[PDB]
Amino acid sequence: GSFTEGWVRFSPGPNAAAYLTLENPGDLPLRLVGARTPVAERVELHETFMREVEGKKVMGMRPVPFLEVPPKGRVELKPGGYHFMLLGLKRPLKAGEEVELDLLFAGGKVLKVVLPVEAR
* CATH number of the domain to which 41 belongs: 2.60.40.1890
Contact of 14 with 87, CB cutoff 8 Å: yes
Q: Please indicate, yes or no, if residue 98 is contained in any of the structural domains.
A: yes
Q: Please indicate, yes or no, if residue 82 is contained in any of the structural domains.
A: yes
Q: Please indicate, yes or no, if residue 65 is contained in any of the structural domains.
A: yes
| CA-to-CA separations, 7 to 13, 31, 44, 114, in angstroms, rounded | 16, 21, 16, 10
Contact of 73 with 28, CB cutoff 8 Å: no
Q: Per the structure, how many domains does the chain have? A: 1
Q: Please indicate, yes or no, if residue 1 is contained in any of the structural domains.
A: no
Strand pairing category for 8-9 and 109-118: parallel
Q: Solved by what technique?
A: NMR
Q: Please indicate, yes or no, if residue 85 is contained in any of the structural domains.
A: yes
Q: Which domain holds residue 86?
A: 6-119
Q: Please indicate, yes or no, if residue 56 is contained in any of the structural domains.
A: yes
